[PDB]
Each structure stands twice: as C-alpha cells, then as structure tokens.
C-alpha cells in the first residue's frame, strides 16, 4: 500500500481545473442543496465520507477518496461486469442518497471526478491507499438490538435523535444526519449491511467491537426508503 496524503488547497492550480475541483468539493459536501434533482434524501456524500478542514473523503477507514481514481475500472458483482468510477458514483446517488444517477457526462459529475483526482494526486495507478474503504466488523454472534438500543440512547441519541432523524443546522443542512426514516439512506445502500455499519461506527467514533456490533444492529432494525 501507499500512505494517505491530503494535498494542500493553497497549491490548487489557477484555471478551469482548479475551479472544477472547488465545485466538486461543494457537490460532495452539500449535495442535497446543490443537486436537488438527483438527491432523494437528506444526505450529502460527506456524511459517510468525512474529511477535515472542509475537504471530503480524506479520513482513513471512512472510505476516503484519496487514491480512488486509480482503482477504477473494477469488477462489480452487483453489475456482473466492470464499472467505471462514474458508474460507482451513480450507484451512490441511487442508494445512499436515495436519488437518481447523474448522466455520465454531467458537468457536476465531472467536477466530482476532478476533485477525487486532485485528492489522488501522486498515488500510483493500481496502488492501494492505507485506510481505503470501510473495514467490515463481523462478530461470531447475532447482534443484540436490545443492548444496541441502550447503547444508542447512551452514546448516539444526543446527536442523531430519539427517532434517528438527526439534527438540522441553521442553513437546513444536516449537522447530524438521519440514521433511519424517510431522509436516511435506502435499503440498497452499503451502509444497510450489518458488518459495514458496524465497521463504520467502530472506526468513526471509544466503542468496543461488541458495542459497535450491537448498536449497528439496533440502527438497522428501523424502516428506511425501499430501493
Ligand atoms: C452512507 C449512507 C454513504 C453515503 C451518503 C455515500 N456513500 Fe459512498 N460509500 C459508502 C460505503 C459504505 C462504501 C463502501 C466502502 C468500501 O469499503 O468499499 C462507499 C463507497 C464509495 C466509493 C468507492 C470507494 C472505493 O472504492 O474505495 C465512491 C467513489 C463513493 N462511495 C462515492 C460517494 C459519493 C460521490 C457520494 C455522494 C453522492 C457517496 N459516496 C455517498 C457509504 C456512503
Ligand atoms: C455527535 C457528536 C455525534 C455522535 C455522538 C454520533 N454521531 Fe454518528 N455522525 C455524526 C456526524 C456529524 C456524521 C456525519 C459524518 C461525519 O463524521 O462528519 C455522523 C455519521 C454517522 C453515520 C453515517 C451517516 C448516516 O447514516 O446518516 C452513522 C451510521 C452514524 N453516524 C451512527 C452513529 C452511531 C451508531 C452513534 C452512537 C455510537 C453515533 N453515530 C454517534 C455525529 C455523531
Ligand atoms: O453504492 S452504495 O450506496 O450501495
């Protein structure tokens, strides 16, 4: 593997590419507001792909975009064939954002690609970046949603809400995003999978493996949009 490095925003190039990258960052950070025709819920890409200092997709073990462009095209079992990064992003819009895929030459899609390529600068094509993806967490027992509920009330509720509906900021963006219900990810999303949610929760928080497993279980007992 190669190390995860975040390029310096002050070294962004003048011109069309620099401008595109800046637009791309905003599409990823503010998706429902910027692309209402394509987003069906309250989630922005950054809600599962966080980054510090205004960037998106720069956190190890929270599916960073650093180095993602050199890993496509790649096989998808879902599609039964090779897919491009453009297509992967489309699946995210359809599942995680409960919406509609952007046309494969849509300027907003190309701006997102430009941003991801910027984050990937210096990464050799084919190389795997340390911290890529969301590492699954699987336990050898059923998740205990009763324990999970207690854990949720103690550790999660103050941000994500008694009803999982999250907390809106002053401008109507989710400060704390919804975990279930009609504004959350739909059943087709990767986050709807127990081991992926447990893994995400484990790495993005102070929780033991058993606690992340049980609280993920509790979260995923709830309704959400059907895909
Ligand atoms: C949580 C509900 C998510 C939201 C909202 C978005 N994404 Fe996502 N993404 C998510 C998971 C759990 C994964 C799998 C991680 C893994 O281990 O493979 C992904 C993956 C991607 C990828 C592929 C990453 C890789 O191959 O390394 C891309 C390019 C991606 N996601 C893009 C993306 C965009 C652009 C989003 C806003 C439209 C977006 N995702 C939202 C979980 C979630
Ligand atoms: C405020 C201090 C929070 C507490 C406590 C918890 N979460 Fe959270 N979560 C929070 C934010 C701001 C975000 C967006 C990503 C980011 O880090 O910037 C999240 C994201 C999630 C997600 C993915 C997004 C979604 O489904 O909407 C999940 C699945 C999630 N959080 C679960 C979760 C659980 C189970 C918690 C208790 C262990 C928990 N979070 C605490 C803010 C906060
Ligand atoms: O592509 S994910 O949202 O399943």
Curated annotation (Swiss-Prot):
Keyword Membrane: no
Compartment(s) of residence: Periplasm
Disruption phenotype: Cells are unable to produce tetrathionate from thiosulfate.
Catalytic reaction(s) noted: 2 thiosulfate + 2 Fe(III)-[cytochrome c] = tetrathionate + 2 Fe(II)-[cytochrome c] + 2 H(+)
Gene Ontology cellular-component annotations: periplasmic space
Noted pH dependence of activity: Optimum pH is 4.2.
Its EC number(s): 1.8.2.2
Residues annotated as binding heme c 1: 45, 48-49
Record PTM: Binds 2 heme c groups covalently per subunit.
Name of one Pfam family that matches: SoxA-TsdA_cyt-c
Major localisation: periplasm
A GO molecular function held by the record: heme binding
Gene3D superfamilies: Cytochrome c-like domain
Enzyme class: oxidoreductase
InterPro entries xref list: Cyt_c-like_dom, Cyt_c-like_dom_sf, Cytochrome_c-type_DH
Residues where heme c 2 binds: 156, 159-160
Keyword annotations from UniProtKB, A to Z: Heme, Iron, Metal-binding, Oxidoreductase, Periplasm, Repeat, Signal
Domain Cytochrome c: start-end pairs: 13-127, 143-223
Quaternary structure, from the entry: Monomer.
Role, per record: Catalyzes the oxidation of 2 molecules of thiosulfate to tetrathionate.
Name listed for the protein in its UniProt record: Thiosulfate dehydrogenase
Gene source species: Allochromatium vinosum (strain ATCC 17899 / DSM 180 / NBRC 103801 / NCIMB 10441 / D) (Chromatium vinosum)
Organism lineage: Bacteria, Pseudomonadati, Pseudomonadota, Gammaproteobacteria, Chromatiales
